[PDB]
Amino acid sequence: QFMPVYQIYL
Amino acid sequence: SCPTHADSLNNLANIKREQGNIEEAVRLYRKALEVFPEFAAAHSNLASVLQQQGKLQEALMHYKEAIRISPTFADAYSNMGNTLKEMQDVQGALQCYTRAIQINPAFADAHSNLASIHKDSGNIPEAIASYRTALKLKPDFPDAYCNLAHCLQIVCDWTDYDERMKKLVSIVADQLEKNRLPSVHPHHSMLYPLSHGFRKAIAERHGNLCLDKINVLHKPPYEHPKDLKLSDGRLRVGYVSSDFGNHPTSHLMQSIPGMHNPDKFEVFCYALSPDDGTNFRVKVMAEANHFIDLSQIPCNGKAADRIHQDGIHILVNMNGYTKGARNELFALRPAPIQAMWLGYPGTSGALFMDYIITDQETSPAEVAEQYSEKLAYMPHTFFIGDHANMFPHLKKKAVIDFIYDNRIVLNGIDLKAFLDSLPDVKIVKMLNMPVIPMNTIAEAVIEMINRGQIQITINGFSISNGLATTQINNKAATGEEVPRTIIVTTRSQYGLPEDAIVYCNFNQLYKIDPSTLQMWANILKRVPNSVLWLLRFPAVGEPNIQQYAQNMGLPQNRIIFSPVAPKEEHVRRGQLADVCLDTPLCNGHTTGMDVLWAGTPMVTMPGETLASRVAASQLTCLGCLELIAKNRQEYEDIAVKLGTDLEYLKKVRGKVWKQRISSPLFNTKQYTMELERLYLQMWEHYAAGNKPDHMI
Ligand SMILES: CC(=O)N[C@H]1[C@@H](OP(=O)(O)OP(=O)(O)OC[C@H]2O[C@@H](n3ccc(=O)[nH]c3=O)[C@H](O)[C@@H]2O)O[C@H](CO)[C@@H](O)[C@@H]1O
């Protein structure tokens, strides 16, 4: 599904 | 037909078998079965001796007869299962092992054989359990103990590690002292603290198993060529491997056969394995002068005949004691000069190998006693990789400022065109590294990473998520093809903190030992906010490694595990780390080339065995001697300095980033020409009338 382990914010 | 007469002959054969005389035992076992045919013991013994002669079908026949005569014969079941396993009939092997356990629940050997079947299939937790059951039934069981020891090594179970190592050394000591086949495999022996002599003796014995299997062929010695007249002044070199395909061996040397000089050399490639359809097999078949599928010739006598009548001068063994090996071909000596090249990090122990191709940095003359064969040195390193050919998109990179070189990385063959399409791009000089500044384009790329999307289009260019390679191009993912898109690779994909020194080790966890985790714990403690990046290789070892990490004082977040990735993604994501901590016990050989191609420095501590000195040799050929540590203190200090002194980290990373292309490490054309020189030295020596001797 290729979601990252965490997310990068604005 | 006197059963007592046949009994006396049976015991006579047992004595002759225990004297290493397999053929006299065979004669007397058949003598017993001609006196009294309904002799179950004689059938099983003749089956065991025929099994080790390699006559599996006949051995299976006599096992069935013994079981028919006395059905309670659980030992014949388990040994018949071993014969079926050797025949690739795993289904029948399981039925034999489990039926033996059914008949005799206390019969430990059947449990141990069942553990081996699970081990071979990657069921390490279940293999561990069955080995423990066998040892619970028979506490003194060296085969069960040593195989279980390897399983615990594979999953990083270090319970009672020190006592286990001493017991392994004593078991090898006893088995060698009693002319018995050691329970430690020669490939595994470089993981336990054995003497170099113990290792060589184990290797020699596993090589004599080949002789027991070819002595039954009664083949006379071959006549070898004494000049290059029939070969048109060309030296005929034959590479024998079961790994011409999607195997790390091909990932290292697939370009080598095509780069031989056709004026002086004729290249023969003998595949011990069938065509798997991968492009690696296609490349070697196309570029080699001749390609022989010896997997279509099971008989080692006839396969050796095929090699001999091809006229090979130098036969190269690229398997050693690894899976798919057919070293019986080398025991029949079809070629005058036989040498070991890449597939095995150790000695053959036997005399059917004349040379071992290495370098002076991996096999110094001091440790030249750990090799039965003679040493053939290569100019810089015996190790080569095909990364310049398989992963040319990793030759240049770019970053996004959200100015690190390893946080949001882009690679691509068509990258420079895409960067020129963008209005503002900053050029960080060093040859240099473009920076995409934060803008609508960068926002869209980060959204694609965050949203879990596969791909996007920017100014008409194909921007691909680094985690979706296999669904964009499956052959690009496996390394069989060069990616035709632009791939984004972020730390957020693998959970790496965006503000931390990332140490990494993408090797299999079996190469980690308690001392190595202790060093890494010391390094992580001295470098604040640093992390250790490992792979679920295997995944069952992750809790075990984590457990010992807590014991050394490291909290949960200090070690980050990530799943094993396809070849291309594995190499590409090494860009995200800062420094690589190599495993001192068994160095990362292919993994070491993989991390160096990413431009990631690697701290190593060379040992004494070839397996423990490869990464140092790679670094010496690269030109980074400051990364090679002479002891545990210096290893920890080097890594800490790289992790705390960011300027020094930046300079060393640039040093590796440039010397990967400049140094001979990844120059395959150079390596081949030097391999050719060493080949010609070996032939000049032989044609002069000299038995093999060291080469430099
Ligand atoms: C101790 C040992 O057995 N060493 C051998 C090993 O090197 P080495 O020990 O480095 O490699 P392994 O046998 O562990 O195989 C690892 C392979 O898996 C790949 N990988 C790894 C992690 C990941 O996430 N994804 C991925 O694709 C690596 O790129 C590599 O091709 O194979 C080489 C190729 O025959 C031999 O020359 C070495 O002697």
Residue B54, phi-psi category: left (phi > 0), alpha (psi -120 to 50), beta (remainder): left
- Say whether B581 sits in a helix, a strand or coil: strand
Which residues, at least 6 apart from B662, have a Cβ–Cβ distance to it below 8 Å?
A: B623
Taking CA B264 as the corner, what is the angle to CA B258 and CA B268, rounded to the nearest 5 degrees? 50
Which residues, at least 6 apart from B22, have a Cβ–Cβ distance to it below 8 Å?
A: B49, B52, B53, B212
Nearest to A6 among B402, B467, B492 (CB): B492
* CA distances, B3 to each of B33, B48, B73, B547 (Å): 10, 21, 19, 61
Q: Which chain B positions have a beta carbon within 8 Å of A2's beta carbon?
A: 452-454, 465, 467-468
Which residues, at least 6 apart from B481, have a Cβ–Cβ distance to it below 8 Å?
A: B279, B473, B475
Q: Which chain A positions have a beta carbon within 8 Å of B449's beta carbon?
A: 4, 8
B590 lines ligand 1 (CB under 6 A): yes
- For the domain covering B502-670, report its CATH number: 3.40.50.2000
Rounded Cα distance, B48 and B295, in Å = 26
Residue B187 is a catalytic residue = yes
Task: Compute chain A's Rg from CA coordinates.
Answer: 8
Q: Which chain B positions have a beta carbon within 8 Å of A7's beta carbon?
A: 450, 492
Rounded Cα distance, B96 and B92, in Å = 6
- By C-alpha distance, which of B24, B59, B666 is closest to B386? B666
Q: Which of residues 1-10 of A touch B (CB under 8 A)?
A: 1-8
Taking the CA of residue B496 and the nearest CA in chain A, the distance in Å comes to 8
Interchain contact B468–A (C-beta under 8 A): yes
> How many beta-carbon pairs below 8 A join chains A and B?
32
Which residues, at least 6 apart from B691, have a Cβ–Cβ distance to it below 8 Å?
A: none
Taking the CA of residue A6 and the nearest CA in chain B, the distance in Å comes to 5
Q: Which chain B positions have a beta carbon within 8 Å of A5's beta carbon?
A: 492-495
Torsion angles phi and psi, residue B163, rounded to 5: -65, -35
Rounded Cα distance, B306 and B240, in Å = 12
DSSP secondary structure of B226-288: SSSTTTTT-EEEEEEES-SSSSHHHHHHTTTGGGS-TTTEEEEEEESS-----HHHHHHHHHS
* CA distances, B660 to each of B427, B507, B574, B593, B620 (Å): 21, 20, 14, 10, 12
Residue of the CA atom closest to atom 5 of ligand 1: B589
Which residues, at least 6 apart from B301, have a Cβ–Cβ distance to it below 8 Å?
A: B214, B217, B219, B332
Nearest to B446 among A5, A6, A8 (CB): A8
- By C-alpha distance, which of B292, B358, B356 is closest to B329? B292
Residue bearing tokens 């040892």: B135
Taking the CA of residue B538 and the nearest CA in chain A, the distance in Å comes to 20
Torsion angles phi and psi, residue B168, rounded to 5: -60, -45
- Say whether B633 sits in a helix, a strand or coil: helix
Ligand 1 center to B192 CA (angstroms): 20
Ligand 1 center to B508 CA (angstroms): 8
Residues B295, B275 contacting (CB under 8 angstroms):
no
Hey, are the CB atoms on A8 and B492 less than 8 Å from each other?
Answer: yes
Residues B426, B389 contacting (CB under 8 angstroms):
no
Method: X-ray
- For the domain covering B229-386+671-688, report its CATH number: 3.40.50.11380
> Ligand 1, closest atom to CA B564?
24
Interchain contact B454–A (C-beta under 8 A): yes
> Ligand 1, closest atom to CA B507?
14
Overall resolution, Å: 3.1
Residues B116, B123 contacting (CB under 8 angstroms):
no
Which among B401, B451, B487, B576 is the top mutation candidate for probing chain A, defined by the most A β-carbons within 10 Å of its own β-carbon? Answer: B451
Ligand 1 center to B510 CA (angstroms): 12
> Ligand 1, closest atom to CA B243?
35
- By C-alpha distance, which of B605, B591, B514 is closest to B162? B514
Peptide bond into B105 cis (omega under 30): no
Ligand 1 center to B490 CA (angstroms): 24
Catalytic residue among B187, B251, B308, B387: B187
B16 lines ligand 1 (CB under 6 A): no
- By C-alpha distance, which of B264, B345, B355, B334 is closest to B292? B334
Interchain contact B215–A (C-beta under 8 A): no
Residues B79, B103 contacting (CB under 8 angstroms):
no
> Ligand 1, closest atom to CA B586?
1
Six-digit token string for B72: 């309670």
Hey, are the CB atoms on B452 and A3 less than 8 Å from each other?
Answer: yes
Which among B401, B439, B443, B446 is the top mutation candidate for probing chain A, defined by the most A β-carbons within 10 Å of its own β-carbon? Answer: B446
CATH number assigned to the domain with residue range B387-493, chosen from the 4 options 2.40.10.10, 3.30.720.150, 3.40.50.300, 3.40.630.30: 3.30.720.150
Nearest to A2 among B408, B467, B495 (CB): B467
- Return the best residue to mutate from B185, B537, B591, B597 for the ligand 1 pocket (most ligand atoms within 8 A of CB): B591
Interchain contact B561–A (C-beta under 8 A): no
B564 lines ligand 1 (CB under 6 A): yes
Rounded Cα distance, B297 and B304, in Å = 10
Q: Which helix (H) or strand (E) holds B374?
A: strand B374-378
**Hey, what amino acid is at B183?**
S
Q: Which chain A positions have a beta carbon within 8 Å of B453's beta carbon?
A: 2
Ligand 1 center to B540 CA (angstroms): 19
Interchain contact B402–A (C-beta under 8 A): yes
CA atoms within 13 A on the CB side of B97: 24
- By C-alpha distance, which of B48, B50, B8 is closest to B31? B8
Output the CA torsion B672→B678→B684→B685 (10° steps): -160
Interchain contact B494–A (C-beta under 8 A): yes
Output the furthest CA–CA distance in chain B (Å, rounded). Answer: 99
